[PDB]
Design a protein around this ligand. Structure first.
Ligand SMILES: Nc1ncnc2c1ncn2[C@@H]1O[C@H](COP(=O)(O)OP(=O)(O)CP(=O)(O)O)[C@@H](O)[C@H]1O
Ligand SMILES: [Cl-]
Ligand code: NA
Length: 340
């Protein structure tokens, strides 16, 4: 019943989580602590994982971010999500897990493909990930998605979605553009996304209100689009903001947010008269010994940010909520929704 406050598209994944012996990594020629895409010989891993009684969980970057929004808003159908699943058991499991959490979802079924799946192999205090994207690459947004997302003002896509087709994110952004007060938000997601999709990002960014990325992703954006330590981060955020604004003034949100690990978050926002406002928000310290790993930290950040944005909070408050959510997630094995 909602109301739906955030709608996202993404590449939905089922995570299969197990503590495993080091021999299992060796069996599949995995390097401890690396995140990779499954090779053909590694496809057998998902079934062979059953010996460990793995736990199935939702995953994928955008999915995890909207699970944060849903957890924090609590009411059923507070966040919505679309992406593609396969025709196999794991897609049915994924749907059930999302329904239990109260997310509104519509998964496109891709016949003949398998659901995206990630073997999450815990061993020696490290997280080793082996992902098969599968059906995720087949997603094509249904034309009635705007009815599914009716009433939402915040729209999100990861740049991972460009792999299926840039059309999906472009259609979400284009719809948002036509709705005064709607916000379209985008994650740079990974260096490969920045490097492969320069043209599609050029168009999408002109339709983007809030751009999220980490330090490495922004370094690549700066190189690919010739944008040219904290001062440098301010320069890059400021440069990136021309990709959203075309150097013109407009009365919509135009904001660039760069996460920076343990260092302060930096953001640049353009106002209606062209002033560039620089935000700097320190990250409350989390002790080294408390951190499990930082996998998924940016997904948690975005989820907290978008939750706070849905509540009408200031930019600094949105960044602070993002930081709080990321703080909790990095102290847990996996993408915990237990917030503190
Ligand atoms: N060591 C640390 N201490 C405190 N907060 C941290 C942290 N590392 C990351 N964070 C939190 O996570 C948010 C997102 O950080 P960032 O985008 O750099 O993570 P990431 O997605 O690059 C992690 P990884 O490299 O492990 O995938 C930060 O803004 C901060 O709030
Ligand atoms: Cl995603
Ligand atoms: Na974690």
């Amino acid at each position: 019943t909602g109301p739906m406050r955030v709608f996202a598209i993404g590449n939905p994944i089922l995570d299969l989580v197990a503590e495993v012996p080091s021999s299992f990594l060796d069996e599949f020629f995995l390097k401890r602590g690396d995140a990779t895409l499954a090779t053909p010989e590694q496809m057998r891993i998902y079934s062979t994982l059953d010996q460990f009684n793995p736990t199935s969980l939702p995953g994928g970057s955008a999915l995890n971010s909207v699970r944060v929004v849903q957890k924090l808003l609590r009411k059923p159908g507070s966040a919505g999500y679309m992406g593609a699943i396969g025709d196999d058991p794991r897609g049915q499991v994924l749907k059930e897990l999302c329904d239990k959490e109260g997310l509104a979802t519509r998964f496109m079924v891709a016949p003949g493909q398998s659901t995206g799946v990630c073997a999450v192999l815990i061993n020696e205090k490290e997280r080793t990930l082996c992902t098969h994207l599968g059906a995720c690459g087949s997603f094509r947004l249904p034309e009635d998605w705007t009815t599914f997302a009716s009433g939402a003002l915040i729209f999100y896509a990861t740049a991972y979605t460009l792999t299926a087709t840039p059309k999906n994110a472009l259609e979400v952004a284009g719809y948002a553009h036509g709705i005064p007060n709607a916000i379209f938000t985008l994650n740079l997601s990974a260096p490969f996304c920045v490097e492969l999709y320069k043209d599609a990002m050029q168009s999408l960014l002109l339709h983007t209100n809030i751009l999220f990325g980490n330090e490495e992703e922004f370094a690549h954006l700066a190189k690919v689009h010739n944008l040219v330590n904290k001062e440098h981060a301010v320069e890059v955020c400021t440069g990136a903001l021309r990709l959203l604004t075309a150097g013109q003034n407009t009365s919509a949100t135009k904001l660039v947010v760069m996460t920076r690990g343990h260092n302060p978050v930096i953001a640049a926002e353009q106002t209606a008269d062209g002033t560039v406002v620089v935000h700097e928000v320190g990250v409350p310290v989390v002790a080294a010994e408390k951190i499990v790993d930082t996998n998924g930290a940016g997904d948690a950040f975005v989820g907290g940010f978008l939750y706070a944005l849905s509540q009408g909070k200031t930019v600094k408050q949105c960044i602070m909520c993002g930081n709080a959510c990321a703080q909790d997630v990095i102290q847990h094995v996996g993408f915990s929704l237990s917030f503190t």
